[PDB]
Design a protein around this ligand. Sequence first.
Ligand SMILES: COc1nc(N2C[C@H]3C(=O)N(C)C(=N)N[C@@]3(c3ccc(F)cc3F)C2)nc(C)c1F
Length: 385
Amino acid sequence: GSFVEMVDNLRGKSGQGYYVEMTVGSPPQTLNILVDTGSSNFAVGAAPHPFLHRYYQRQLSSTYRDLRKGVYVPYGKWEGELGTDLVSIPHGPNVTVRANIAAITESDKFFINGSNWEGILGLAYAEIARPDDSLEPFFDSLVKQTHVPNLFSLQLCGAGFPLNQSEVLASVGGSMIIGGIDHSLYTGSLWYTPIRREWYYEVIIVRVEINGQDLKMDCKEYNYDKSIVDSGTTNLRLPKKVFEAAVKSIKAASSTEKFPDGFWLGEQLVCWQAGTTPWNIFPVISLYLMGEVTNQSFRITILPQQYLRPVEDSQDDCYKFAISQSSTGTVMGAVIMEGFYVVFDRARKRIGFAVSACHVHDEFRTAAVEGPFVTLDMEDCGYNI
Ligand SMILES: COc1nc(N2C[C@H]3C(=O)N(C)C(=N)N[C@@]3(c3ccc(F)cc3F)C2)nc(C)c1F
């Protein structure tokens, strides 16, 4: 329904991540925590680091419990010490839970200078928790210990322009609704895709279009080796072969302007005179997802206002191409999530999408969530082995 206490509780941006305020320990220690649907550990800075202005001080918490076990995570990388403590979300459900916490003591290229977050809240399933699936993730603890419904929803709000150091701290970056769906955060209908398996938030893509033109690849290629929804990734990441076909089609649709190789590789910015970004030359991208009804799919459509990420250069409007290659499957990252209100319905093993009330668009085109479409043999789109 309406969850006013949680609306507008996020800050950040697609390139540095979106974070929520949390408290750990007794008395409570306030920390900003990155919302990550791509991992399943709650891990916080617990020792001085040049990029941290605060960290979890276990010796100052009367409710700290030492699990006497280390955790080593090479992905960047971080190392820590496992323990439990009382955790709350001030702009969240009015509950306090006893949760696992990985106290980060050593790290390399993990913390981002100026991101304003000091830890990560892994919201995915126990299967991918470190060191193993016996370390209960935060959300599992929250549901087990309280009457909070087994569901959360995310509205990540891209500003559509660069935010400087002060503006990003003062700006609302979106909402994380814990235990519900807030109807003010979306327009139109919510469409649901099944969660294929509970590890990452794995989904099945059944068709891809660029300006309505079918990419026409065997649908197994779109999900090779998996397709996931990940708020902790900036870009829309596509499998190598899919990325090559998609970039060729996006280049062909936008061919009235020639961009350098570095732009298409997501490395180099492109700039236009203030207000003149030629949105209309870039195509919309539609991803069709498996529906909840047999032989039915629906589509989510994004604009270049989602896949062109605003960056500072001057008075020019500058962007980086936020679609990149992957060797680990499709990743529907923040730049795709910015177009939609996304419902992680764990209780019903499904993910919902609706057009976000905060998506960036122009007067001629909008993001969309539409259906149904008749789609056959959708289970064949899923990859095995
Ligand atoms: C919290 O614990 C664990 N965390 C991770 N992560 C893997 C990282 C990554 O590559 N992506 C795409 C991701 N989505 N998240 C991460 C992440 C996100 C934003 C960021 F600025 C830094 C990050 F490191 C964090 N992986 C395991 C197994 C963890 F146990």
